[PDB]
Amino acid sequence: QALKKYTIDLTERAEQGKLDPVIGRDEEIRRTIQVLQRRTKNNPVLIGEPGVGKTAIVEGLAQRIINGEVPEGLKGRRVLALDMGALVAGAKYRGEFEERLKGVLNDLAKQEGNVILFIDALHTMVGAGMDAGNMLKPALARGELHCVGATTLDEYRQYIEKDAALERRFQKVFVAEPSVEDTIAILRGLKERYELHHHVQITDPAIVAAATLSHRYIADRQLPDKAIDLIDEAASSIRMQIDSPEELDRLDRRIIQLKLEQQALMLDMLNEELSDKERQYSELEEEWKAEKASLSGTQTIKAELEQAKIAIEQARRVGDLARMSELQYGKIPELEKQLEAATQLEGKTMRLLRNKVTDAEIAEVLARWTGIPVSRMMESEREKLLRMEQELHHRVIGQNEAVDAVSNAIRRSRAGLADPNRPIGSFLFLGPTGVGKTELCKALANFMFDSDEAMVRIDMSEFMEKHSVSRLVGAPPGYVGYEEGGYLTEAVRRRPYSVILLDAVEKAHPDVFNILLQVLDDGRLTDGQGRTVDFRNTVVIMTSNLGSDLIQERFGELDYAHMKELVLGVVSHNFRPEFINRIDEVVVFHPLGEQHIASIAQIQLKRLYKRLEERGYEIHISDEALKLLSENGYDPVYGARPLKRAIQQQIENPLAQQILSGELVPGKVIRLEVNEDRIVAVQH
Amino acid sequence: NRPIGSFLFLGPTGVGKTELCKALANFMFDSDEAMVRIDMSEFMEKHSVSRLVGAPPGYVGYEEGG
Amino acid sequence: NRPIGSFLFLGPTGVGKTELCKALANFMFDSDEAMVRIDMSEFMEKHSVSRLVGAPPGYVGYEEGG
Amino acid sequence: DLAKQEGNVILFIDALHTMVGAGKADGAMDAGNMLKPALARGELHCVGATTLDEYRQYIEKDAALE
Amino acid sequence: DLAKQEGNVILFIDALHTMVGAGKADGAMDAGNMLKPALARGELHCVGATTLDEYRQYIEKDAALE
């Protein structure tokens, strides 16, 4: 009998309780039963996206057979998971796959509708050598086989609707993507199951958080697979936090360090200090063990409560009389009240940890799983984030407007208040150059990542032509670089939280601005292959200087408001009215001043000190030399880089001229003094 | 003989056009974005029909469909 | 973060500009014809952009760059 | 055999994308079909190790093993 | 058998790009994803030989064996 040798008895697994009780899929299970109780085309095959429960429907059907709540035409059936693996794996000699397949069909014919065939993974069947389709394509539409396939959406099109007769040998059953609250109920039943396994507790805000977050941030996988990804992962992580602690390892490093110190010293006092700290470490250790033991006993009585529920449902199947009222009125109230007694015992004695899983833990799982930072405002990053504008004036001096703006942007991201239709900040910088557009964005990247060029740095000055649209997007199918995909969307879907610089945006033929109409409007963009990328955790920033005459003309004697209004009119001359409505904030830079120039002077000096400290040399500067650099690095029209060219020439040429001269010695402070109008370099 | 709503919308900018379409999607299927939002701001060239429709046989993305 | 030096020479022709550059190359490698010489006077239309930086995906000479 | 070791064995694969399309033949068994159920119900403990490049090209095409 | 040789053998291959695309059949295994392990450890003392353009087209497509 091949049925012993080449399938899986799923009814035994459901009988022995190796399965997940599926909540829901009401219409689709009833649809399965509708399509199975026919005469010709007795074959449904479940179709949905991968994840939404194409195994879950068949296992929930199988349990309903075990629960016996089926319509009467399906009582007494069998559900056998057809193993393509062994049925191909034996087939060494000629004809063996076909012989075993024939013998399977004859044995299932001998049972006469007693066994509902369940092919898992339908597209594994087809190519097996004629060989595999045209043996059964006759026997399928004769009613003698009740097969329920279960396979993906894609493999339907690519591995079935090729051979069209095999396609008409079935019924599509469109398994839907599950919704929000249905996913919530599914998670509640499975919450009970993972609280069997992972020895923890699960909160209900954890449930609504897993639903809300998996539907909101991630795009790639689907409900209810990824909400289970969150819950199962957080269960294992909190299992590890109970299993591990930080204060214990702090005190452990302290006691081993003081032990090494006292061993080096052998005045003492450190025998007493080490005795006190070992006593404290053993006390925290014993509290740790007592807390772990309390949670252990809590979980043992939780699991024995669950097995009591299983046994009383076995009684509801069989019909034992005193067992019903006995198990109910004895075992349920006393074990639930001492489960709650152990729970409030945890609420009393857990000091040093977390016994539950809450929205904090789901948030921590989600941020450490993808990389969108939605975890709760921990204190150090909150202090750093409150010190936004303290930090930003250490790579951009002046220009307080957009400093404040991007401060607001990062806040309204991390506080969660922003509109989740749209990206965080679709900023747009103006102002004539030499003022710090590119530098504000570099300072952002270093702020957010501790990396300067770790940002998706599109440079808009290549897109003057009508086709670097399909540079950035992707290459549509049939063409050459389809198999790559673009540079924007690929580098965003690798890391969903990054800052797209768009340097020098006015250069382009405005088709790229149609692409950015989608981008800034709703944050989805379609790549070449057709699979969308969500931009709703990114800060799209564009720099330009389409207001050079205006701001260089009138930054004095004007406000910031009419400044913004008049340059907004100028951008409306250049850009499109479709587009500047989508901007998060049109901000207006302005030309720098003398304190600012002195600041940038000092910054370039400090990085030069760093460079020559990598050379290994020490440098002081005269303040009159700073006056040389200030009056040699000043102008209205060109902004900062006059200072950099003046620094570059009037320091580095005579300096390094003297360096490879061998005039200068490692060990002397290279003091920058002045001549009449040139910096003189002294060595003493 | 025709699809049901063969609509074309016009007007000034930002005035609830895509909103009305998501409002239908929220109505008909209780989901804001469950609607095929094919965006005609990618198709500024000839070969973009081969993006949205599909590919002729023998060539690159032919088995994936459009 | 900037390249080594970026100079705009000027003058009337035939005074030695190209020779200064070739003198650099014939110094730095002992070769005039080991440098990169992009004859920018060809570029009288806006295409040779897409001969020096390369032609984007979905176009002709894609896999050989600029 | 790994069912006969009860989770004592964490399986490791380097270069995971040798597995999608491993031995697809006259019998299109692929070693992806066979690993897919054990990978679903977590019965194995298989840790891959793949390049970020070929994760796109050779594994996101086989969406059920994604 | 070169592991048998106790590190006393230098492997020479001309047209290393040919070896990269050598066994790459439709859902099979090439020498590229088989020399991925024996070269990051490097018990196999390979020596390559290639043309500059087809290095760029062929091997730099495969970053790990790049």
Partner: peptide, 24 residues
């Protein structure tokens, strides 16, 4: 008697190109 041996079955796919005009 012998066994139906497995094969190798090398397959291939192709590419289009695209050429693009200028307006002026």
């Amino acid at each position: 008697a012998a066994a139906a041996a497995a094969a190798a079955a090398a397959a291939a796919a192709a590419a289009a190109a695209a050429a693009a005009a200028a307006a002026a």
